[PDB]
Amino acid sequence: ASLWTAASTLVKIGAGLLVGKLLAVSFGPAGLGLAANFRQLITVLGVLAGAGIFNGVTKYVAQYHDNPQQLRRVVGTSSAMVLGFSTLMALVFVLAAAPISQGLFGNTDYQGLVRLVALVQMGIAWGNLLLALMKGFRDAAGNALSLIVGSLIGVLAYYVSYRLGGYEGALLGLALIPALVVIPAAIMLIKRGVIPLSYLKPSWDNGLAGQLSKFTLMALITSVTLPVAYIMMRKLLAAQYSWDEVGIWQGVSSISDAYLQFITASFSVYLLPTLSRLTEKRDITREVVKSLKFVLPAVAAASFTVWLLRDFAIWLLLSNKFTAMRDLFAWQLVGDVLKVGAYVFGYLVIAKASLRFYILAEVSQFTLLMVFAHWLIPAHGALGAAQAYMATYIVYFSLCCGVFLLWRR
Template sequence: MAAGWIRASIASAIAQLTRMFCGLAVLKIVVMQLGVEGIGKLGHFMNLLSILFVFAGGGINVGIAKYVAQYENSKAQLDEFLSAAWTYSLLASCVLAVVFVAGAHAASVLLFGDSQYQRLIIFVGLAQFAFAYINFVTGVVNGLRQTQAFSRILTIGSLIGIIPCYFLVSAYQLSGAVVALVLVQAGMLIPATRELGKLIKLRPRFTARLGETGKLGQFSLMQLSSVATMPLVEMYIRTELARIVGWEGAGTWQGVQRLSYAALSLFISFLSVYYMPTLSALTDGRKIVSYVVKTLGGVLLVFGFAAMSIYFLRGLVFSILLSKDFFIAPDLLRYQLVGDFFRIGAYVIGFLAVAKAATKLYVIGELVQSGFYVVSFLIASHLAGGRGVFIAYALSNFCYFLVCFAGLAFYARARLRAAT
């Protein structure tokens, strides 16, 4: 058992690192070919793709994993559920596609100031059918606890997707970059289909079961709260930033944000794979609080060291991962790293709500975090112009961390009172 766990952990780590490096490779190619201004405009499509990849098919992959694990030993129930989930996913994708096709012109004008990007928006909206299938498969794979199969999907899919990226960006510029980003995600179609065929014989039927639909709808609501908050907030901030300092300034912010996401994703992967399952299994209030506090201290210590290393080696880091022409003022980078520090701290505490399936608390947390960011940006940009976006990032994450820590203290007090 220990050997299997170790192999699964190694496979998961390799998959996450591969996915991270492929994402950074695309970013590097775009900076080389399109410059910092290109990164600024591409940022909107990055947010659209992150929204679609999470919400494609209704955002039910976590729900699929839950109920596949629950019905695993009952073939009849599993078949009925998968047919209902397949129907739900397909219908949700159709609705989403109609929204993107119908709203492409308005979205292009709103985000970029003209309609020339509406075809790309339609393309992205149709690509989510592939994302929905991938989400369906990974939900089944995770529900069956096939960690190595999931890792193979991520690793092989990322490598398949990255192969044509340089040609696409160099030949077709921004349009090619959008297609490249889609392929990095859609590359998982091939290994996903293969892994699903090895695990189960799926013969999906189109069926509507109110009970299963209601269960899956709850997961759609949770995912909708995620995709309707921070990604949309970032799109709003990027548009305002382009108005204040131009697309090059917005591109500088976008480049730094993507590097932050890459660093944060490694820590979030650890929290998802190791921390949250352990937290979910704990029932004693004192042990839960103790585990959260210990993990918080360890993660902040490691991340703090990594952040200081990035700051002092910033010239080398940015020249390797972006370009030698990329520059960000040291004080602005400090704000970004401070924001990342408190953001990962808030994640550690916030995973407690996820582990205990506190849906309302999760939704409220997403809204509060996004609200802090918007308010901080409006104030800081008014006082400091384009520099304000970095100040707002640090300030909003610090405030949200304080809210999360206060929530943890309240939870600890309530559980200790219940135990006495």
């Protein structure tokens, strides 16, 4: 099970580095910067499409997998939420394609790309639902093979998209990578025969829909905080300097997201299920502290190694046209430690399913990101964004400990 997840995370990382490298070598810092706001929208779609209930889907599919009547209502209401929201999403993308292009790119020259997303997001919503269902039925193999195939065809789709369409093709490729996974997930769901197909018939259970709505509010809150913040910050950096300067700072985040993904799963399936079962404050503190005793030195060592080979990392994963960001590593990699450090406090809020505290944590990150950006970015450029990213999580980590200590007492 956990080795299936490792296989998925590995192929996903390798393919992500591969497509990230090809995008860098082909379109340079201007392309990496211009594409970042578009890549921010795709990940949000993976978070907030099909009502963003797929975390709750897997939880309740496994909870009611023994009761056939309640299992059918869970999958049935999940398909209904996906169908309704995927269709409304399509209408939103065809009618507001120009204003969405403006917010993401600064001009309306990407309307056709935004309108095409209306069809692409359907594969993301339906694909992630089929993956969530396979996770709920404890099918780690069917989940992993679907992700591996989806990553393999995503590289093929991205290569053909950018060769034909140019830069806007490469952007379409970045959306097609998570959307095409619905092809192997569907084929795997069929032949593995774990889930009856009639269960996918859209029905509506007001009980499960309201409970699954709480997962929708989480994705809603998540999608309109840090993504919105990072969008305005890259836009302000581009306006005061250039999109080429945004790609300098974007290359730093793109390099860190590689090793920061494997460490994420090291305290995801190992920490989140454990923090849910425990109920005593002493036992909560005994695992919050002991998780930091492993997570902090692990990211510190990994990030320090990246800074030790900052020149090699730039040359390897990107191009020597990104050499200017070697000075950004010290500030961003520090902020990475404090950000992942505060993740332990974030997964504690998710384990308690506290919407109140989840809202407070996301807006805290959003605010600190916005204040520190209006001061650093207009003066220091990409270094200002890397300094705002570090100043944010230096304060946010310290606030997270104070909030935890008050809550602990």
